[PDB]
Ligand binder design. Structure first.
Ligand SMILES: O=C(COc1ccccc1P(=O)(O)O)Nc1cccc(Cl)c1Cl
Ligand SMILES: O=C(COc1ccccc1P(=O)(O)O)Nc1cccc(Cl)c1Cl
Ligand SMILES: [Cl-]
Ligand SMILES: [Cl-]
Ligand SMILES: [Cl-]
Ligand SMILES: [Cl-]
Ligand SMILES: [Mg+2]
Ligand SMILES: [Mg+2]
Ligand SMILES: [Mg+2]
Ligand SMILES: [Mg+2]
Ligand SMILES: [Mg+2]
Ligand SMILES: [Mg+2]
Ligand SMILES: [Mg+2]
Ligand SMILES: [Mg+2]
Ligand SMILES: [Mg+2]
Ligand SMILES: [Mg+2]
Lengths: 228, 228
């Protein structure tokens, strides 16, 4: 439906939608912008991520409420409605994964863009894994793992240890280990090594970069406190 | 789309949607329940009102953000996007007004139901008036006024001055006077008389009814403080 709107108009309206807290509209504007076929700038990548993270975050919160009610009950209505919300969540994840596969990741050559998109691929397979069961669950977990791992490999080679995208990737991959992969030790090791290597590199930063990096380091520390 | 689902299943899912904060789903379930053609119980009327008030409240907040940006700017994008949100808001209001006209109000014979629905009719024409301009604005304002006035007439004849639906009607009609009809004196007079007549009737109430009534009386007092 966004095929007739200018790329720049879609980006302008995504920013308006963010100000209005209209995240479904924001996501649809950014999907239309991606579908124009041009690469995204750093600012535009962040708009894309904010839009979908807010949409899927609402779905995940709803799914958890309904799943909890369903588990306590264990007619068909609670299961039906949890399945409805689950299907819509899966559809959002599949949409984001589709944009990354057609063709954001393959055209992303710079480390900052390529790591950003592979982290997104990890995150959306992670959200699919949260609602998956059984074997099907295994291949989805492995897809998340693989994406995160490729992102980590590039990030370690190409970015300093305080880079916020590198930090955010390591934070989310640590959460994947603790919450999805049943690997709390790997989660704790990753978060601690990431924190310590960032701390050692802070001296190289300006006041503003220091604020950006320490904000995400505090998230790693909050998890380490939750986990130990 | 809800024609195939049982009335009781729609009500059950509206309650699940409320717990999950999925207000658009809640509204669609309650629209389907109304369209079954049976009258609504007190609990079901409240589900209908909560669902739509949350949906339209999100739209009104967005519309205000976009309208403010538009006014400060005074390309077409801000106006286009404000018009999109405005049209969707109007559509929600027209949907609610349609349910009241087909056929909730005409089958509502008891004072508690009839006042509830006429207050809703007042409120949704009020939301249409907030975004209307010009003459068209006049007939919409008069529709809101007329609905509120019929509700007030029944409420004064049929309900005690502490009844929460009577109190809530008077609160919203006072807001209509102050914010829509440019009649701050009528707003203040209504809120003050309503407050005083409720205060005089509190002695007749149980502990729980007293809590219900004084909660809404505090809203009247908060407005009187804002307005004087
Ligand atoms: O509360 C959280 C915390 O999740 C973190 C924390 C650190 C890094 C990444 C995430 P997330 O990508 O949101 O799972 N996420 C969240 C956000 C919205 C809805 C729901 Cl149900 C959840 Cl769990
Ligand atoms: O902040 C309010 C206060 O509105 C009142 C106050 C007392 C009675 C009735 C109402 P309302 O029916 O929400 O206009 N409402 C509101 C609720 C959601 C979005 C927006 Cl923009 C608004 Cl203005
Ligand atoms: Cl359902
Ligand atoms: Cl490339
Ligand atoms: Cl638009
Ligand atoms: Cl009747
Ligand atoms: Mg063009
Ligand atoms: Mg049942
Ligand atoms: Mg399923
Ligand atoms: Mg490239
Ligand atoms: Mg580099
Ligand atoms: Mg039936
Ligand atoms: Mg422009
Ligand atoms: Mg218009
Ligand atoms: Mg009747
Ligand atoms: Mg009576």
């Amino acid at each position: 439906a966004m095929g007739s709107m200018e790329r720049a108009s879609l980006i302008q309206k995504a920013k308006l939608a963010e100000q209005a807290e209209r995240y479904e509209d924001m996501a649809a504007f950014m999907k239309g912008a991606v579908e124009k076929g041009e690469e995204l700038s750093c600012e535009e990548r962040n708009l894309l991520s904010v839009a979908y993270k807010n949409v899927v975050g609402g779905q995940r919160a709803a799914w958890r409420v309904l799943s909890s009610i369903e588990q306590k009950s264990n007619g068909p209505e609670v299961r039906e409605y949890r399945e409805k919300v689950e299907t819509e969540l899966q559809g959002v994840c599949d949409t984001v994964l589709g944009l990354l596969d057609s063709h954001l990741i393959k055209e992303a050559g710079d480390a900052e863009s390529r790591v950003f998109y592979l982290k997104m691929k990890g995150d959306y397979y992670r959200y699919l894994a949260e609602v998956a069961t059984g074997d099907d669950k295994k291949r989805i977990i492995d897809s998340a793992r693989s994406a995160y791992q490729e992102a980590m490999d590039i990030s370690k080679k190409e970015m300093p240890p305080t880079n916020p995208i590198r930090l955010g990737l390591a934070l989310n991959f640590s959460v994947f280990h603790y919450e999805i992969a049943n690997s709390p030790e790997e989660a704790i090791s990753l978060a601690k090594t990431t924190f310590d290597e960032a701390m050692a590199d802070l001296h190289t930063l300006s006041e503003d970069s220091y604020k950006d990096s320490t904000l995400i380091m505090q998230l790693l520390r909050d998890n380490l406190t939750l986990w130990t």
